[model samples]
Target: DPEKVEMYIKNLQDDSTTVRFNAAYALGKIGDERAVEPLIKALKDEDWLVRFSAARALGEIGDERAVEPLIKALKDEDSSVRFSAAYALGKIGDERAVEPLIKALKDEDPRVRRIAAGALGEIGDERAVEPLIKALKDEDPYVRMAAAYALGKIGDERAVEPLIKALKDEDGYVRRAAAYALGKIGDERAVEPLIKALKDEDENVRLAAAQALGKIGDERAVEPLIKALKDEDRYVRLTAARALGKIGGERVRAAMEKLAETGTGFARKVAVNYLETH
Candidate 1:
């Protein structure tokens, strides 16, 4: 009913804190345009939950009126409220947020920085690439992981070397993210580093490297991808088989045939399938 939306909007300033929280949360779920201006005003409410819900509501409504208010909230003293606005601004995907969110990459709280990196990526404005590349070696692995993918989504060649360096990060997730992003960049500079990552201790990282090398389609990856065929994890082996197929030639065909005869279980089936069709 019209009363429900307007009632919730009006309650955003209700005398009790709990009532305002519930109202903002309701407006977000309802996602009506009328709630946009009201929620933006509630972004300054004394209660953190009220502010959190208000930013979240504006994000759900995705009205441009909320963008600047949400950007200002990125500095909210409450950690949760900070990321919520960072996320809300991200959801809005305004190019205007790109610069503000870049500064957020250095926010005091790591989680806020993490959310800001993701926000910048989701927005994918060209302005984010260099700042995102700088985030590659943050002390926090999650931040580095988010930054790598953001660079890939933006598709900037400038991100290649820093992401290449990230392949050696101690965190397996960071390494895997770098492998995947470097593949998307598909730079010749990445081929050697990705080959090095095929031997990463984590099976997931190995799989990402195999998949990346396939996208690069470089002959240099053939030897390393063949070695990856013997990885203990089936997904790693499967990805290696697919990589080999993508870089196909008489040499890789012979590699696939050797696997068809010698490799076991799923790896064998993958080789036979590659040979039969292509």
Candidate 2:
């Protein structure tokens, strides 16, 4: 196995770009620390594919030593290479990466921007919050969605208002992402807007709103969440019941009792379980 890893490392220098690329790819999958230094060297290979593979390989290895090289790779001419470098730095999750990953958020390539958003989320660093807020307005829906998602993952209070505004994004997925982010941030500030969001035409947005309200556990949400118990969607009904359970006031007890007595399937089960615990 050591011999095979060594052979793969040697192949990183092969004359054929394809061979070097595949060799770096296999070395990354093999997950030997020995491959990291060679893969770093391969990042400078003349072939873009080889450089791409090297960046991806370093990410798979997830070594701290790869962080600086991957940061440099973020400026690689190829978008794919930049994407891989952003992803790898995220996987490595070093504080050193926070600013570089933030810079990658504005890369000309939308895919790079999207991946950088995700990498920032993976790092869960607060420094990315402001930049990620700006990303929510990106022209690309995919980038906007990623920005909303990363904001939630970061869970910074500063992002609450921006994420609340994102709830109105033209893209349904972006709205859904905003709901999910607002919930993760778990700020009481989001409770009222989320209550309003219960009326969103999109069932998924309504579902995320219900779940997020539960996560926030604001007393104000108890009444709206109780009303959500009657939403036409069964999943929405189930999520509402669970949210009420999480809010856990004497007021919620009556609703849980009613759902336990009359609701169907999982909704009924969730209500019954809530009654049992509280």
Candidate 3:
């Protein structure tokens, strides 16, 4: 194992980009600390893809020694390298890399901005909260979605208010991401708004809202979901039924029993699952 790892390490300087790139990939799989500095040196090599491999290799290796070089790589001429390095630093998740990732949220390359948000989320640093909120409103829908995704990863209560606002994002995916974060954080403030999102035109968004309501398990959402048990989409109806079952009391029984015999076989099974067990 040691000899194999050493051969992979020396290949970081091999004549062919193909060889060096493969070396980066292989050393990353090996993930030996001895390989960390060699990979860092390889990060500045002539070929872009080789550097790309090196950057991601450092990320996959997740060595503390790679953080500074990984942070500097954010300034690489290629967007791919910048983002690859950003992706690597995120995997390392050191607080020292936090500010640079925050600045990267404004990268001209949308992909870099997106991954930087993801890195901030990976770090879970308190310092990243405000910048992430601004990112949630980015003109790029995917960027906003990634920001929402990261904000939820941080799980600060401050994000709950903004995430509730995000429940109405113009993009259905963003709305779903918002609802997902709310479900993870479980704030009472989101229950009414999440109930409102249950009316979304997108079946998936409505489904996401149903799941969030179940996580919150607030009784206020219980009656609203009674109609959702019959939602046009099967998964939405199933999720709504499960949401009610999550609350687990006579209230669940009243709504579930009322519907148990009324719908198709699938709905019948969902309601009966709760009924027979209780």
Candidate 4:
């Protein structure tokens, strides 16, 4: 492992940037803790590609040793560096970086803010809940979307109300993200807004709503999700059936029973799975 580390270090000076990147990537995969310190220094490399690989490598190394240096990278002038730093820290899943990454949501660059929010969600520390909730109101639509997604990943009941409000965000992307988040959280409180989202003019929004309701698995959602199974879009129908299965219950089983007798081949398959599971 030590010998391989030498190769990784030497790869940094290879003629091709690609070689340098692969080296960094490989060093990370080798997953030796010693790689952390070297990767930290690599983050300062002038090449964004090298920095990117270095960040990922540090994540793979998974030692707290690199945490401080990676944190500093979050403030790097290069957007790529900042994004990589946030992503790396998230993958590391260290609680120490939680507060700093939360503050990163205020970064001037939307991309950086978005990555920071997503990272917090990945970390899933309770400390991030309040900050993530506040991120829902960020001026950037992308940031808001990222916050919704992160909250869903966290599965905290506290986020349900904010996600519901996010359903009304003017940006379609934000609405879609909110719908997806509410679905993943699977809290009963989100049922009403999720139902309303099913009727959204945007097909994507409607699909996201259908999927979310399914994730919640409320008996009330069974019939509605079944209706979605009849949707014109194959993807929508597929997801609707998937949701029914996720919420397996007497109602879901009953719906599947009805489908087996008359539904299309794809529909029958979905119904069968629902019946077997529920």
Best by TM-score: 1
Could you tell me every candidate's TM-score relative to the true structure?
A: 0.94, 0.92, 0.94, 0.80
lDDT of 1 by residue, 1-278 (tens): 78999998889879999999999999999889988888888999999999999999888999998988888998889999999999999999888888899999999899888989999989878788888888896889899999998988888898988888889898999999999998998998999988888888998999999999999999999878877777889899888887888887878788778988988877677778888987
TM-score between model 3 and native: 0.94
In the range 1-278, model 3's lDDT, one tens digit per residue, is: 89998998888888988999999999888888888888989989999999999999989888899999998999999999999999999999888899999999999999999999999998899899999999998989999999999988899999999999998888999999999999888888999999999999999899999999998888998878887876889899889877887878788787668768775566667677778887
Name the regions of candidate 4 deviating beyond 4 angstroms. 7-26, 45-53, 245-278
lDDT of 4 by residue, 1-278 (tens): 69988888787778888888888889988887766766777888878879978987887788888788888888888888888889889988898889889889889899999999989989889888888899999999989999999999998999999999999999999999999988888889989888888778787888899888877877777777777777787878788877777776676677889898778867788877766666
TM-score of 4: 0.80
TM-score of 1: 0.94
lDDT for each candidate structure:
0.89, 0.89, 0.90, 0.85
Candidate with the larger TM-score of 1 and 3: 1
Off by over 4 Å in 2: 256-277
Candidate 3 Cα outliers beyond 4 Å, as residue runs? 260-269
Superposed Cα deviation of residue 52, candidate 2 (Å): 0.9
C-alpha-based local distance difference test score of model 3? 0.90
Best-to-worst ranking by lDDT: 3, 2, 1, 4
